[PDB]
Symmetry: D2
Subunit: 142 residues, 4 copies
Amino acid sequence: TYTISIRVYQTTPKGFFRPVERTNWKYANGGTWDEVRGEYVLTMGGSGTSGSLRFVSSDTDESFVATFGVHNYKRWCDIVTNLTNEQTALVINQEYYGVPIRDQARENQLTSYNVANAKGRRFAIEYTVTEGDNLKANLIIG
Amino acid sequence: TYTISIRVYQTTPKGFFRPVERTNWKYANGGTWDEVRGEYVLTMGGSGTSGSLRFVSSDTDESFVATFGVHNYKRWCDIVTNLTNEQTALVINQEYYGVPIRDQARENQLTSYNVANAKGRRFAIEYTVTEGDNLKANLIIG
Amino acid sequence: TYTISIRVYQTTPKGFFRPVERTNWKYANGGTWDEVRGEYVLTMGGSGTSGSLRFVSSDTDESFVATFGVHNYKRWCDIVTNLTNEQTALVINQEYYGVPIRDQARENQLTSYNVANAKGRRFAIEYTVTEGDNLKANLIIG
Amino acid sequence: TYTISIRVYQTTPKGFFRPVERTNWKYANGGTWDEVRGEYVLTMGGSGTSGSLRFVSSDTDESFVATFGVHNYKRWCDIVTNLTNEQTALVINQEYYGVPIRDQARENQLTSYNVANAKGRRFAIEYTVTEGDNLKANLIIG
Ligand SMILES: [C]C(=O)[N][C]1[C](O[C]2O[C]([C][O])[C]([O])[C]([O])[C]2[O])[C]([O])[C]([C][O])O2[C]1O2[C][C]([N])C([O])=O
Ligand SMILES: [C]C(=O)[N][C]1[C](O[C]2O[C]([C][O])[C]([O])[C]([O])[C]2[O])[C]([O])[C]([C][O])O2[C]1O2[C][C]([N])C([O])=O
Ligand SMILES: [C]C(=O)[N][C]1[C](O[C]2O[C]([C][O])[C]([O])[C]([O])[C]2[O])[C]([O])[C]([C][O])O2[C]1O2[C][C]([N])C([O])=O
Ligand SMILES: [C]C(=O)[N][C]1[C](O[C]2O[C]([C][O])[C]([O])[C]([O])[C]2[O])[C]([O])[C]([C][O])O2[C]1O2[C][C]([N])C([O])=O
Ligand SMILES: CC(=O)N[C@@H]1[C@@H](O)[C@H](O)[C@@H](CO)O[C@@H]1O
Ligand SMILES: CC(=O)N[C@@H]1[C@@H](O)[C@H](O)[C@@H](CO)O[C@@H]1O
């Protein structure tokens, strides 16, 4: 059993991102999302699956999907932004298991990743605990 | 714009169901899940999409996925229980748009539905507001 | 360090109680309230303090304050209902340290307590784990 | 009826502040705290009362209480930090109605306030809507 506990940091008062969706991929006996002591906790039944969080800022027409998982016993993460209205977390989460560019992101097994949207705002995931079964990460909104 | 506001009633202190997943289907410009005054609010861009909530009782090995949406301008609902580990809300939500046994449930446009798991526990959805833009439902865990 | 983890059960779809307030008394190095896996967790720095939760049903003009603590190394609980508009949880929590009838409730060190409001609805606290530093309780709304 | 809707911005991934307490003062027929679309909403019956939020960073031994309300039909705010274990939100909220050093802060009817703790971390409240029934504020953690 793995857990990934996520702390969300919203660094600028320009815009307001709110949680809108949390999904679990079906591999490795699935997983769950819990809220624990102000953090988002993804629990997974083994190595080889993942979960996604979507955040939306309706003030500024911005959004992103942040995905966290374990691939071949190493943690991974990705962020997708510039989302179409069809790109919910349900959609994005699944694409990491068949879409070459998404597959690659997962295979990279990154301890940190950042990307910016077309509006110039950057988002980042930073794993603070990178080993073991109780992983920890910061999700930083620029 | 449609909203479905859901009040959850957990009625029996045997086991404990906790929220573990909330998904949005990609049709009709997608949608969002918000927590509002103790209720779950599914917001959708138009008719033809849906969202799912999964609840799990770890203590009793029980779970279900409750799905809510609008089909041909009428509200619908369904509950799936006796879940395998592979049947996350991400999986179940998607099945309502291609899997015949799920398609037909959506097409039924039900104002109420109830089902039992293998242990005999009943789960119910009852829409209290069945018309207009802002729909309301009770999710009752037996 | 003590924890009291509380599972809330709302047993009837008549009315809807929502959380509106959570307070910590100042004795025994204070305490905190956390949301953990769908439960309300009161953490306290020792024996001799408590915390309160207030729930309101605006549909039916009903409310109550449920208080949980440890007195002389034994758990206690109480419920106050038929609240005046001045009886917030901030007020009620404090009254267990100076008001004779409230003092008595605390001194009783009950593993279970129930009371009904003037409208005929009963509320109950039931400790499922009654010993140790990780106590557990059901808050049952009739 | 007044509302104050609060957006929380945690801006620095050093330490992690989590919500631990939310209180309502008893004047003006009291009030409630609700979570609405990722925001904290304080609702009050009329002018002359307030509510407090406490946040704690366990990893860095930091904490603060942020208080919001309406005094003589104008919004007010304050932040207290460098807290002892005995300074819960229940304690601090009440002090604004009898303790001169707190009374004067309420009477100031501030649209913005900022303060630093002993470690040099700044905390700020800025009202973005300063007039009418439905007030809005940012709570910024430095
Ligand atoms: C161990 C790991 O991680 N692996 C992985 C996987 O996961 C898996 O899946 C399966 C089905 O297919 C099941 O579910 C199990 O349980 C799990 O574990 C997958 O995910 C993949 C993607 O697709 O990836 C990974 O792997 C790689 C390869 N295939 C090998 O094996 O090596
Ligand atoms: C109107 C309605 O409701 N319709 C429906 C639909 O939805 C849709 O989808 C599309 C794609 O395909 C888009 O997204 C839009 O936007 C929407 O609206 C669908 O969902 C279906 C299922 O699949 O169902 C319904 O319909 C009926 C028929 N099929 C038609 O199409 O018309
Ligand atoms: C141990 C116990 O529990 N005790 C108690 C108390 O608590 C206390 O308090 C103090 C001040 O006063 C401090 O804070 C400390 O820390 C604590 O611990 C109190 O609370 C009381 C009520 O008032 O009760 C109890 O006790 C009894 C008597 N006093 C004896 O001691 O025994
Ligand atoms: C109008 C206003 O805001 N006022 C105020 C007050 O509030 C009040 O309170 C009372 C008792 O005392 C009752 O609760 C009512 O309802 C209300 O409204 C108070 O709070 C104060 C503080 O303590 O402050 C304000 O005011 C001024 C003067 N002091 C008078 O009284 O007028
Ligand atoms: C702007 C944007 O969202 N780019 C994403 C990138 O972050 C992600 O790593 C990749 C694979 O999923 O898909 C897109 O290229
Ligand atoms: C109807 C009602 O709320 N009664 C309460 C009772 O439950 C509580 O035990 C006592 C001491 O706090 O105060 C009141 O009598």
